[PDB]
Amino acid sequence: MNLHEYQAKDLLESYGLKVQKGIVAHNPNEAAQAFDQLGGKFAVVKAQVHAGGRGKAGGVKVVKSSQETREVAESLIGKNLVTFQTDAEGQPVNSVGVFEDVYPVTRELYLGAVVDRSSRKVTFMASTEGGVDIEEVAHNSPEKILKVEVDPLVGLQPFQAREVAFKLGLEGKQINDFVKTMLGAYKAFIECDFALFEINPLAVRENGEIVCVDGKINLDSNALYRHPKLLALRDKSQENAKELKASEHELNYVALEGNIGCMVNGAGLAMATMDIIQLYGGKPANFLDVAILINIFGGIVRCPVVVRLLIPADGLADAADKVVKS
Amino acid sequence: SVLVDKNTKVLVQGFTGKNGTFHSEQAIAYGTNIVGGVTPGKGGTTHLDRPVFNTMAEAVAATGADASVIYVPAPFVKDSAIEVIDSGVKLVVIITEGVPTLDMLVVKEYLKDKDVRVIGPNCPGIITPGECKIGIMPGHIHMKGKVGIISRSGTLTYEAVAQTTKLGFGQSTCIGIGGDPIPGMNQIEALKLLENDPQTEAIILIGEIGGTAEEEAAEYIKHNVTKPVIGYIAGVTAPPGKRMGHAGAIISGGKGTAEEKFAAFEAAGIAYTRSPAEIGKKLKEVTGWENLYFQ
Ligand SMILES: CC(C)(COP(=O)(O)OP(=O)(O)OC[C@H]1O[C@@H](n2cnc3c(N)ncnc32)[C@H](O)[C@@H]1OP(=O)(O)O)[C@@H](O)C(=O)NCCC(=O)NCCS
The missing domain is CATH 3.40.50.261 (Succinyl-CoA synthetase domains)
Structure with a gap:
């Protein structure tokens, strides 16, 4: 489950991290009032959607007045924002954040963490190369990605955060501030069942302040039953409507771009079913897990339209063949 | 074969539940040795003509089981997994879907010095x-x-x-x-x-x-x-x-x-x-x- 920027910043601020503070505006008047409340010369208005690349899509704007804030909020609220991380229809903008200007930033750092499947440990990644595609840095210059594996018994220790801070070229009070930032992030990660987080950029201001400017928090949806306040952050408007409809009947639907539908028991068999269609010239419309091919085997689940257990089919190959031939 | 064979004595955690009941009945029909099960609060009862225990400690003491299968809902799996790892059972199978990743991170690290294998979850x-x-x-x-x-x-x-x-x-x-x-x-x-x-x-x-x-x-x-x-x-x-x-x-x-x-x-x-x-x-x-x- 994704959080909005404003939600991720409120959460990290509650763990003692310094964030680019802002105010959520659900209409243009609240936005104008927000610009005045911050009391800065400049603010940054950001469309609150679950997808990065908002800046290049026109969803991030510097403003210098209450009326200008009202105007930008006017142009954004109620129009779907299409970014490189949405599809062609984009995500609904029901609010903007009005944020303090952190200009001037000296340096953009990267800090994130995931559950690393290979080591089976919470693992932080940090880099001097912030504010860019961290995947491209990792590919071109892997020596610039610092990793810290966290031992679950002792958790993240200050020395581990200090090792990273010195390697990032941080100095004086910045070391202590980064240690507090990374230790807070770890506490949040465990206490909130994060699946991942990213602070990109983790900005260093002219005066040495360490500030979370943007990034992402994804929560483990398996754990939301024990975080009622986080489950209450859910924004169903950012989800695919067809995916959302299906999930409310505890059905797993993923839409593709093809012209064959399929109904399957098991995620592995659903992918294999799709793949054996595309193997037989077909283009799958969808993954679905309880022209259409129905394909049921049965373990816990007890047993034009092709049916492999109306055109009937005898094996996997038969069904893939028959259903593309339709 | 590996890990399980005709001598394996199996306990069921959530034995009295819907899936514990169904799959235990199928296992018994297959010739699998279901020696009983654990559902807290149902200790001292009979289910499928097998004993039910309140705790895995009681169940292992009574049955000498060496395997357990978990049919408990996701929120209770970490607790059920540590209980069976602590019991003397050598092999644990977790069917449950929806277990938090960070619960399995802890359970997997808990296994490192133990004579216990866990298969699963999901x-x-x-x-x-x-x-x-x-x-x-x-x-x-x-x-x-x-x-x-x-x-x-x-x-x-x-x-x-x-x-x-x-x-x-x-x-x-x-x-x-x-x-x-x-x-x-x-x-x-x-x-x-x-x-x-x-x-x-x-x-x-x-x-x-x-x-x-x-x-x-x-x-x-x-x-x-x-x-x-x-x-x-x-x-x-x-x-x-x-x-x-x-x-x-x-x-x-x-x-x-x-x-x-x-x-x-x-x-x-x-x-x-x-x-x-x-x-x-x-x-x-x-x-x-x-x-x-x-x-
Ligand atoms: C685990 C799962 C099967 C349980 O579903 P279920 O059988 O319908 O659940 P029920 O509530 O009927 O039974 C659960 C039982 O566990 C018991 N239980 C709860 N905590 C327990 C614990 N710590 N120890 C033992 N039993 C426990 C409950 O008391 C209940 O028994 P009761 O009904 O007699 O009180 C279900 O949550 C699930 O994960 N299903 C999907 C499984 C799947 O598809 N896996 C992938 C296969 S490839």
Whole structure:
């Protein structure tokens, strides 16, 4: 489950991290009032959607007045924002954040963490190369990605955060501030069942302040039953409507771009079913897990339209063949 | 066979529940030794003509069980898993879907100094056909034989079982390690067991999108597995950034894709099929074994 920027910043601020503070505006008047409340010369208005690349899509704007804030909020609220991380229809903008200007930033750092499947440990990644595609840095210059594996018994220790801070070229009070930032992030990660987080950029201001400017928090949806306040952050408007409809009947639907539908028991068999269609010239419309091919085997689940257990089919190959031939 | 056989004594955690009841009845019909179960608050009762206990400590003291299968809802799995790891039981199978990743991170680290194996969660379990089934897999599609199977899926595993049953090869032991990001038993752990099992003469390795487990398994096989391995990877067609049902089935940042798992098999000398219908056929081609059910 994704959080909005404003939600991720409120959460990290509650763990003692310094964030680019802002105010959520659900209409243009609240936005104008927000610009005045911050009391800065400049603010940054950001469309609150679950997808990065908002800046290049026109969803991030510097403003210098209450009326200008009202105007930008006017142009954004109620129009779907299409970014490189949405599809062609984009995500609904029901609010903007009005944020303090952190200009001037000296340096953009990267800090994130995931559950690393290979080591089976919470693992932080940090880099001097912030504010860019961290995947491209990792590919071109892997020596610039610092990793810290966290031992679950002792958790993240200050020395581990200090090792990273010195390697990032941080100095004086910045070391202590980064240690507090990374230790807070770890506490949040465990206490909130994060699946991942990213602070990109983790900005260093002219005066040495360490500030979370943007990034992402994804929560483990398996754990939301024990975080009622986080489950209450859910924004169903950012989800695919067809995916959302299906999930409310505890059905797993993923839409593709093809012209064959399929109904399957098991995620592995659903992918294999799709793949054996595309193997037989077909283009799958969808993954679905309880022209259409129905394909049921049965373990816990007890047993034009092709049916492999109306055109009937005898094996996997038969069904893939028959259903593309339709 | 590995880990389970006709001597295995099985306890059921959540024995009195819907799935605990159904699958225990199927296991008993298959000849699996279900010695009883644990449901807190139902101690001292009878279910399926077997004793029910309040605690795994009571259940092990009474039955000498050496295996347990968990049919408890996801919020109670960490507690149920630590309870059985502490009890003296050597083998734990977790069927449950929806266990938090960070609960399995803790349970997996807890195992490091223990004489206990955990299979799952979010898995169909383990079966030694003709001797013992622990989990939800249909017994009748299996047949005692010579193919070991390791899979991150349920029903997709059943395709590989049906294919090897229909060719007359049969299965030694089949292990569904499950679809979650941190399983209690990974591919390499299972490959070592099958490598050292004389009944296993060839191995099927079934994977999908997510992680680097198949790439790592390929690097292990190249230097530590002498038996023929046939690979199959589901999810060539999955979009990136999308959970494909399984918590562990997701392509994140150009990693966890299918064609690079196929490329790691090639580099390790591991035969594979791109067709889920042709796992048995590829195994027959690689081994040159007879299909005794053709004539
Ligand atoms: C685990 C699962 C099967 C349970 O579903 P269920 O059988 O319908 O659940 P029920 O509530 O009927 O039974 C659960 C039982 O566990 C018991 N239980 C709860 N905590 C327990 C504990 N710590 N120890 C033991 N038993 C416990 C409950 O008391 C209940 O028994 P009761 O009904 O007699 O009180 C379900 O949550 C699930 O994960 N299903 C999907 C499984 C799946 O598809 N896996 C992938 C296979 S490839």
